[PDB]
Amino acid sequence: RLIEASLYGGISSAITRSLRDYLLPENSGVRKAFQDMEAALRENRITLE
Amino acid sequence: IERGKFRSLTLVNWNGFFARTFDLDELVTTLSGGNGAGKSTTMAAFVTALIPDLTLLHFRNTTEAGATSGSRDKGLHGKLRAGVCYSTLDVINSRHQRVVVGVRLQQVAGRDRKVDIKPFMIQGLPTAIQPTQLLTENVGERQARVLP
Amino acid sequence: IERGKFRSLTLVNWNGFFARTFDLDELVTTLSGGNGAGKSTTMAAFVTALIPDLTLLHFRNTTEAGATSGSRDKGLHGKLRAGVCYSTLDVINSRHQRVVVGVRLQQVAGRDRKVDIKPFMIQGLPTAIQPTQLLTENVGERQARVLPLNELKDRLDEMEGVQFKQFNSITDYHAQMFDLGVIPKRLRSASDRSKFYRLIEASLYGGISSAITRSLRDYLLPENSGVRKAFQDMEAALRENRITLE
Amino acid sequence: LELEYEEFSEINDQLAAMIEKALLVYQQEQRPLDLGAVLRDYLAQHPLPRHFDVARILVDQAVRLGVAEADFSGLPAEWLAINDYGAKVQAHVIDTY
Amino acid sequence: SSKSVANIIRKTIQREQNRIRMLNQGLQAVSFGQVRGVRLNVNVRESHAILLDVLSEQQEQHQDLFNSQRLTFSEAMAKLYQRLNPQVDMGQRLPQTIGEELLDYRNYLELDVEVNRGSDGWLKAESGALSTGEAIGTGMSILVMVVQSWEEESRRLRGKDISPCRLLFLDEAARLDAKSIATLFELCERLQMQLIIAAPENISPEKGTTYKLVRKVFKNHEHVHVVGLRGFG
Amino acid sequence: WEEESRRLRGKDISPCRLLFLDEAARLDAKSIATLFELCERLQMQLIIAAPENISPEKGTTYKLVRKVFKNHEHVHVVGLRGFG
Amino acid sequence: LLDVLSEQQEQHQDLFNSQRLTFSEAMAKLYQRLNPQVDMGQRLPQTIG
Amino acid sequence: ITIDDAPYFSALYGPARHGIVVPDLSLVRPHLETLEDCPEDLYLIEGDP
Amino acid sequence: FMPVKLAQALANSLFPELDSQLRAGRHIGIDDLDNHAFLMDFQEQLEEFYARYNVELIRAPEGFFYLRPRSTTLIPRSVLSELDMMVGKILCYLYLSPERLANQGIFTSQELYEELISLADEGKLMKFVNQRSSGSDLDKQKLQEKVRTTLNRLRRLGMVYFLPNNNNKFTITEAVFRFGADVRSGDDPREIQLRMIR
Amino acid sequence: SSTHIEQFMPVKLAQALANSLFPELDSQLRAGRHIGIDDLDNHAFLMDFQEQLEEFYARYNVELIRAPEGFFYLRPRSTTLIPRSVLSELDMMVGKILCYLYLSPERLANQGIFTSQELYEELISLADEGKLMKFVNQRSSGSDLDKQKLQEKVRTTLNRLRRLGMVYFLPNNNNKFTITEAVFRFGADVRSGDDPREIQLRMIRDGEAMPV
């Protein structure tokens, strides 16, 4: 996507539309904590359904 | 720290190029020539060499840019000639290591205009060897041949 | 013999142009200036005066030349300015009759970026009067005043032999343009307008147009009635009988 | 074989230099500039085949100096002749520097 | 009935083929990169060619289907067409409509665009198989084809001493090289057709009128300064 | 992206940087000057294409000419230099 | 919403007398839970939780 | 033909407007005796169709 | 949201049926007036709709439409038999010039049977029935049976249209070209088709 | 107004069809897979747009059905646009046994994890072993080779049920698996305490089941 947008030049429609996904990096520390909570929220979903 | 750089690009048996090597610049490299000379073809060869993913590769015209078309033909096959073809890059690592990346391209016989790709890599090649000579055999009186 | 010609293009109170007139060449006219100077704006003016239909008018950027409709903005609103704006063409027929055709443009107030458009035509104007003079008043201020359609109608009706026609529908406007030989085909219906606009905009952006290529026979071949109407008349007696039975 | 080479000519850059030096006086004195007269005087210093390029470059240099206040009057300018063989120019006088 | 209908259809087809062939000649030897010519290839579909021949010469074998007064002529045409090429399916549409489709001559013709590229012969024009400039040039060619056809069509509804104006655009014209621009100028001049082209100063065509634009800020407002040149050459 | 990978990468390696732009002729001189200074400040390599030589005083340039020759095609490449 | 979930009943009931935060709102997001209006698909986006 | 020349031509050709062009007019001479089913006044003209 | 024209297209009454057919692998030729027109009208959006399944909607240069699955296909895939391709290639050969005068577009099972038998190599034939088979009546009978079977398969594909009666006589559609050889400038179709057949 | 989604389709239906989950689900559903409570994503999706999906699929002459146990599945009509097929009697034997296993509180302590051997042992405990062996081979008389063949056929059919979504193998061990509520469809002939013949008639009338 990156390369092709550079080649044809200009404001690439796909890049801007998902700019979060492109720019912001992912964090493993966030994940490790969230694991626990993940389990809990899954369980709650179960019940709800 | 010294950042890595692309030294050169080599094309073998492409549409209009038999064996040509462009030496890239540290900052900017420009290609000029009348319509149909072969500039966009050089771009395509570079990108191909970079990302061999055949699923992705789709060389539209500069006009019709940005239109998701699903065209019947991705436009790569016609840029290749019959027989074997190559596209390679020479890179100087931040470690001051010379590495040669590339691909072997070849048309597929059959009604569908399909293409075959085989990546490869070379490490430790002596600085005195040029890719153009490494990829060809001198047969006859200055009438070299390409080798698989 | 002696094909007609477009003589000039005039802009009034557009973005960057308060009052400007371009004298068009008989063969080639070249617009030249740095990026963002306003070249594409002038061509936008030309085509909007030629085809004043807000359903078709869409000035997408040259990059992304072929994509879908996408945004709800048609790209025209931003080229206008607050107040009243005009775009006019000056034409000379094979008969050597001077006819001025154009539209009046205004930004409709609101949250959204919408525009209001009204066509008009003038005939019999003397060769000594230029469009910019017709559409502006030279008041004491540093800059003139653009005068609305009411003032314009009053000003023109005062002239001897000059006729001012103001249209209520695009169809009438195209009919008059065809009768005077300004366009090569009389745009019967909205479909004809769409094909004509396809032609113009395909020329504007350049490249082998996809739409033209798909419907090639629809564009290049005229439709012939002779083969048909005989059989519609011969078929008539049966058609009426069937309908009566039902 | 080994790659050959070819070189560019700087004649047009030199031409731009002479014109800009010749034109700088108008700004410094804030003297009203008329393209018609200036082009007619300046084209006389070069042969016919080069006139077009000289005209283009001179216009490029002149437009950077101020604006013409007449442009807001609603009155179009005339097409002034600047040489024989029939070349013409259209521009209002430059007043606001 | 029968033969006469076939003859009018054949003559209409023949006239269209000839007019196309005349338009076709104006586009010979147009140089756009490696493209050297453009054509409109016109052909007749087989499934209709055999139908036209049958209607011309085997009418005694099908007259039952034509003079049966329980069905109309267009319906007869549709039924005959289904009798030939039986594998054809019909989408639950009235036979009347299929009949009127058979009555329209255009449906008998197949149309393509071809280009004479480089060392190769005549190839179908595909955008993905051309450079940028070649694509632009081919587009202009087809557009002038359309304009000429439309003028020929309408002249039977226009005054005897009226000749409509013809004008086309080109944005970002810098994409074409000098040779291509010379070709395009030659075409438009031979076709008495006006052009308006935009380029960021990279091209300076000696013939025609030129306008220099410069955008400025004046009294805290955007303003465009304009200068014009013409007559050179 | 480069920043992201700071941890996984070895300390001693800075990745290569390279971008493209076709039909550069759409840009005027001021715009290209801006683009060049941006890319050189970021140690970014560029490859650009245009029918006419739009960048005469920076970097390297190649000129391509295609010749029809014995019922096939051949491309001839020659370099260009700022001054002569 | 992070403030709503983070701060719990016993200590922050004295804080909860503000008009913007309450417990029931976590279940009110059940409405938002069912389907947000995501458009492009890669990896796996699912819901407010 | 255009609307402007239509009245002129219609006046010029008079009753013969709806005749047939036939370049020889001697090849019809044998056929002619058979014409028992035709308009009461048939017009024939010689020239290149 | 969803593009307006895509919603219009899939709202059409013809869509469910065509969907069903397509997913099966059926090829839509110029014969199917309504289906072919529908695809011509809404191609730009149907291509996007089926791309969501990792399946490609292709319009062959001859004019017929069909689906091609990727490796990542969301639709369960299936593959043809060797005998299948054999037969297919045969039919592509029979789409000849003298065919028009020989049969007026309508063939019989026996034409294909005998052509198959005559043009193929014995060994591959054996491979098709069973390697232990040897020029026996029963073998020939089974081969006939298989021929019929595969032919039916093909008819499901839309390659071949049976004339509406119990007897086995049929006509060949243009979509059979999918079996065909690669064409190079000036090459004779008969020769190249035979070259692959060999 | 014109060019407005509502002209051709309800907004909620278009919203559903545009979701990223739809193609997967559609593909699966058409293939005959049953959807239970454990695959949350899918199940939830189904729940959210139930009526739109039902209405949609109706176009095909197929019913999108919801069993009382909370599992979704496809039932084609006689005029169906999509083919319909029937399960084998061995599949039924394994199905009814899997059903009894799900109910059994005696084995609930396993937390749903069962072994092929336990299934096989339960099956032979209830059905007529030597008479059931007839389906494996006409000459079967209790030989170990034939007993191993029976076990392999069971393993195979079980693998087919797994594909229908009726049972899930463990992530790393294939000799063990877990049940889902979708198995209750094998009890459709006895869930109501009434005349078996009438029940069977009702089922065939509804298109649920065919005889052999």
Ligand SMILES: Nc1ncnc2c1ncn2[C@@H]1O[C@H](COP(=O)(O)OP(=O)(O)OP(=O)(O)O)[C@@H](O)[C@H]1O
């Ligand atoms: N897929 C293809 N099949 C056949 N010919 C091709 C294909 N792609 C390119 N060509 C031809 O190869 C030649 C080189 O095209 P290319 O686009 O590389 O040129 P260029 O110098 O970049 O031109 P432009 O600046 O106009 O884009 C042209 O003749 C083009 O027609």
Ligand SMILES: Nc1ncnc2c1ncn2[C@@H]1O[C@H](COP(=O)(O)OP(=O)(O)OP(=O)(O)O)[C@@H](O)[C@H]1O
């Ligand atoms: N709809 C719009 N809204 C706001 N600003 C606009 C709009 N359209 C154009 N502009 C601005 O008007 C100025 C002129 O734009 P325009 O497209 O006419 O430039 P140009 O001279 O054709 O440029 P180029 O040839 O490089 O494309 C630019 O500043 C552009 O940003």
Ligand SMILES: [Mg+2]
């Ligand atoms: Mg190119």
Ligand SMILES: [Mg+2]
């Ligand atoms: Mg522009």
